[PDB]
A paper describes a structure:
Here, we report that [name] binds host complement factor I (FI) and facilitates cleavage of complement components C3b and C4b independently of any cofactors (e.g., FH, C4BP), thereby allowing the pathogen to evade host defence. We show that [name] not only exhibits a high-affinity interaction with bovine complement factor I, but it also serves as a co-factor for factor I to promote cleavage of complement C3b and C4b. This protein-protein interaction thus plays a crucial role in modulating the complement activation on the bacterial cell surface and increasing bacterial resistance to complement-mediated killing.
To identify structural features of [name] that would aid in its function, we sought a high-resolution crystal structure of the protein. Thus, to improve the chance of protein crystallization, we modified the protein construct by removing the first 94 N-terminal residues, predicted to be disordered, and mutating a stretch of surface-exposed, charged residues (E315A, K316A, and K317A) at the C-terminus. By removing the flexible N-terminal region and lowering the surface entropy on the C-terminus, we were able obtain protein crystals with high diffraction quality. The modified variant [name]-195 and its selenomethionine derivative were then used to solve and refine the protein structure to a resolution of 2.0 Å. [name] is a predominantly β-stranded structure which forms an N-terminal domain (NTD) and a C-terminal domain (CTD) connected by a 13-residue linker peptide. The eight β-strands on the C-terminus fold into a barrel, coined the barrel domain, and the six β-strands on the N-terminus form an open-hand-like structure, referred to as the handle domain. These two domains are held stably together through a network of hydrogen bonds. We also observed two short helices present in the loop regions of the protein. Noticeably, the overall architecture of [name] resembles that of previously known Slam-dependent SLPs. We postulate that the conserved β-barrel CTD serves as a Slam-recognition motif whereas the varying NTD and loop regions dictate the protein function through specific protein interactions.
Numbering used by the authors: 103 to 318
Write the structure that this text describes.
Amino acid sequence: SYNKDAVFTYELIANPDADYSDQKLILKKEISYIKLNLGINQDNKNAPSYIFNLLDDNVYYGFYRDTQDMNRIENKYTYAFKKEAENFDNLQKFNATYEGQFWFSSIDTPNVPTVARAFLTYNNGRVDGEILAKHWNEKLFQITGFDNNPRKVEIFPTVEYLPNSGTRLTKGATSPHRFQMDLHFINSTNGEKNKYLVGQGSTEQYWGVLGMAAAQ
């Protein structure tokens, strides 16, 4: 049921008559399947309904916009991968480094997409990494292995306020605002094993998706 040729999204149609009455801001929610090209896919550069990053024919990540009450809009982060392309090798002594991006929104700005840079190192099973601000080397999150499983990480904040947010987080490894993430190693269509790494997670205060590529 993976199909980068028909990716689910919502078209959210503004209700014009809400300009002059107490009707919902959104008139209708309509399903709309997108066919992805390699790289960044979006319909509008300044008010996109969705952004998806097809890293490879076998895996994408991104978000589409949703609303539960037809008034408030929030980004829904997701990822998908060809099932057969997932790598199930034993990665307990894995040696590799990944570089990519973390896309997220915060509870007080649920429709505002924040992009950060992400780095993850596998050294003989030890899993450690970091999430940095897009344009400068400020550390936003620490990444660490969870439960001695190379496919599970724990991500915890190292700042009290994320970009574009005024929601105060607690910092550090015992922070109740940390979260755990299941990761999936995806092989490339050009025969690179474990080339791509995707997962997603959430807390009450922020939620997002992680997508990464191996350093060759």
